[PDB]
Design a protein around this ligand. Structure first.
Ligand SMILES: CC(=O)N[C@@H](CC(C)C)C(=O)N[C@@H](Cc1ccccc1)C(=O)O
Ligand SMILES: CC(=O)N[C@@H](CC(C)C)C(=O)N[C@@H](Cc1ccccc1)C(=O)O
Ligand SMILES: [Ca+2]
Ligand SMILES: [Ca+2]
Ligand SMILES: [Ca+2]
Ligand SMILES: [Ca+2]
Ligand SMILES: [Ca+2]
Ligand SMILES: [Ca+2]
Ligand SMILES: [Ca+2]
Ligand SMILES: [Ca+2]
Ligand SMILES: [Ca+2]
Ligand SMILES: [Ca+2]
Ligand SMILES: [Ca+2]
Ligand SMILES: [Ca+2]
Ligand SMILES: [Cl-]
Lengths: 353, 359
């Protein structure tokens, strides 16, 4: 196995694919160097065209070390690689490295599988879908499926849903292709890696137990998560006909200040809603108190309601909105929150006692 | 106690005075047209003064530092912040944002023991910053030898010098400050060094240093820092510097740093040994590890001495090169069983000593 490639053609591939699970599989075959990384749950494969003389073969080398060596070399460096016995030699200028290897034959593969559902979409649309909902995924819930993210196709829409039982996020985007009605749950790490590959359209293939994403010369494949993901349609309030609208940054900063004097564990704040006014209060066991009064647009009935302020702040930070709409039902029911100018994402938060 | 002040006039003071429950509070005092803010951990203290141009009323209290800081930071830029005592609480009001914080009595706020100034000098802030930045990284962290967990400040003739060592590597920096000084040295605790450094912006306000038998004080503009000294004996840096090294190599700092950084990848993770082979205008760096992986770097340098080899800890050498931020570096060599002294090729102000390794 031999190849010579420009540093700059290796960096992003090495970054994307980065005992044998600590190694990268390198394969020179036909006109291409393939680099694969895996943790047994997911894998990333990068293809790099070899325009300089090369010789076929395969090995595995330590991922971090190989990446650090390449990125540590100067801009414009040419990197010559060749397998010598059981070592992999890396040479560039008068820099030389000899890395340990493990046999390519030992590198693990995911089980073979068939594509059942397929669609293409812009990278920007996938970024939007993930960033809109990722923060609402559970962390270490015994309901393992809540620790990942639902990807649902319905009509011509792709939708993401994330929830931890206390708050929920849902985002739907049109992708202009007739889709089957189908849903899958992508594990947390898979969502992270899928986001990290978005710098070229994205081609997605979904099987019974796997999802695959093709972007440029990268292919990401992940196992899916088993389980019954809750239906967001049963979580959206049926008729939250009290509508308050407010500036997103103004509201966020008021909540952020009140939060300072909220209970450190339970983070409770109280909202008092009245004609074109919102009052936010907070208190803690030290009997310290915060109060914020804000002008809003509200012409519904007066009510009060309590929330974990972190969940509300999380939503406002995700929206990056100009104005926000809060849609209320009563003091003991969830609230729905949206960008005042877009229905494409919605957020549901439980009240506190 | 009452005052009203613009948000931004509190932020820098609050940053500076922030780091037993009352140690988590700041002392606030309104007196003779000035708000004073004090933070302390019993070892050191920072006092910040803010001039009061708006109406105020005298008095003193203490308030949770982080909460008060976070409230002030969280208010909008330019906000007017009105503060008054109300019973056992401190009220903070700005626009339609209102807060009521707990207080502890000013009478319970602890003071450092009284002391007398014995040695004093004034220098530019930039000079003190240069002296501390050049050596700070070489202080010990939580060594059993408590006197190394800090920095030596030495006056001699007309110069001020800092020394820092962890028993393995050493940094020293000396700067002339244009004042006749007594020959004196003290050890400032590492947390105090860090706090002192954070107080200096390198601006046009002069820095005044006062040293007593057991304390040091630094005054710049509206800020006064006081710390206890470490009551111990510090090592003599003159005995650590390799005596009259006979060999001198000079290289580009970034090129040398990048060569060591790449070689370090395949060095022992615990002991970090790399080997140098020096020959006419050439350096070769090698590294290997227990898995028998190997790195080699060859680069052009300026060297006309005898051929020799030496090993050292590459983490310590990288620390030096990162601290120097130099165009060119000089390595002063003797042999494979002696320490190395490293300096900026164009300044003798700072020097660094790293021990040899047999690899
Ligand atoms: C505690 C609760 O009632 N939570 C509701 C969702 C929030 C308003 C986001 C809810 O409808 N919970 C149901 C369904 C469910 C289950 C898991 C995750 C989200 C929603 C329930 O707890 O069974
Ligand atoms: C281990 C060793 O010999 N250390 C020397 C200093 C390094 C080269 C920085 C050394 O000279 N050690 C002496 C003096 C000393 C003591 C504490 C801290 C620094 C220097 C010794 O160990 O007694
Ligand atoms: Ca190439
Ligand atoms: Ca070699
Ligand atoms: Ca079909
Ligand atoms: Ca209040
Ligand atoms: Ca939607
Ligand atoms: Ca302090
Ligand atoms: Ca404002
Ligand atoms: Ca005093
Ligand atoms: Ca003096
Ligand atoms: Ca001198
Ligand atoms: Ca020497
Ligand atoms: Ca000897
Ligand atoms: Cl109190």
């Amino acid at each position: 196995m031999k190849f010579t490639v420009e540093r700059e053609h290796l960096l992003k591939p090495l970054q994307q694919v980065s005992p044998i699970l600590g190694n990268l599989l390198l394969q020179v075959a036909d006109g291409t160097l393939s680099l694969t990384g895996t943790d047994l749950e997911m894998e990333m494969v990068a293809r790099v065209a070899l325009v300089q003389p090369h010789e076929p073969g395969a090995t595995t080398v330590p991922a971090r070390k190989f990446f650090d060596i390449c990125r540590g070399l100067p801009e414009g460096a040419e990197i010559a690689v060749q397998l010598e016995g059981e070592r992999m030699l890396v040479r560039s200028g008068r820099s030389r490295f000899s890395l340990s290897t493990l046999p390519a034959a030992d590198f693990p593969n995911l089980d073979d599988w068939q594509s059942e559902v397929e669609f293409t979409l812009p990278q920007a649309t996938m970024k939007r879908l993930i960033e809109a909902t990722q923060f609402s995924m559970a962390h270490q819930d015994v309901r393992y499926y809540l620790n990942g993210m639902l990807f649902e196709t319905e009509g011509e829409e792709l939708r993401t849903v994330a929830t931890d039982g206390h708050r929920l996020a849902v985002c739907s985007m049109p992708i202009g292709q007739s889709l089957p009605s189908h849903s899958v749950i992508v594990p947390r790490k898979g969502v992270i890696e899928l986001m990290r590959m978005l710098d070229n359209p994205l081609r997605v293939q979904i099987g019974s137990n796997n999802i695959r994403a093709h972007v440029g010369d990268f292919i990401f494949t992940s196992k899916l998560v088993d389980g019954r993901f809750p239906d967001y349609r049963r979580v959206l309030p049926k008729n939250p006909d009290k509508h308050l609208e407010a500036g997103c940054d103004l509201l966020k900063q008021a909540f952020a200040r009140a939060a300072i004097l909220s209970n450190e564990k339970f983070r409770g704040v109280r909202l008092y809603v009245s004609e074109n006014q919102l009052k936010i209060t907070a208190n803690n066991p030290e009997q310290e108190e915060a109060e914020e009064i804000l002008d809003v647009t509200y012409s519904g009935a007066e009510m009060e309601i309590g929330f974990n302020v972190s969940y509300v702040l999380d939503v406002l930070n995700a929206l990056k909105c100009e104005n926000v709409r809060m849609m209320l039902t009563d003091s003991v029911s969830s609230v729905q929150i949206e960008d005042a100018a877009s229905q494409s994402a919605a957020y549901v938060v439980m009240p506190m006692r």
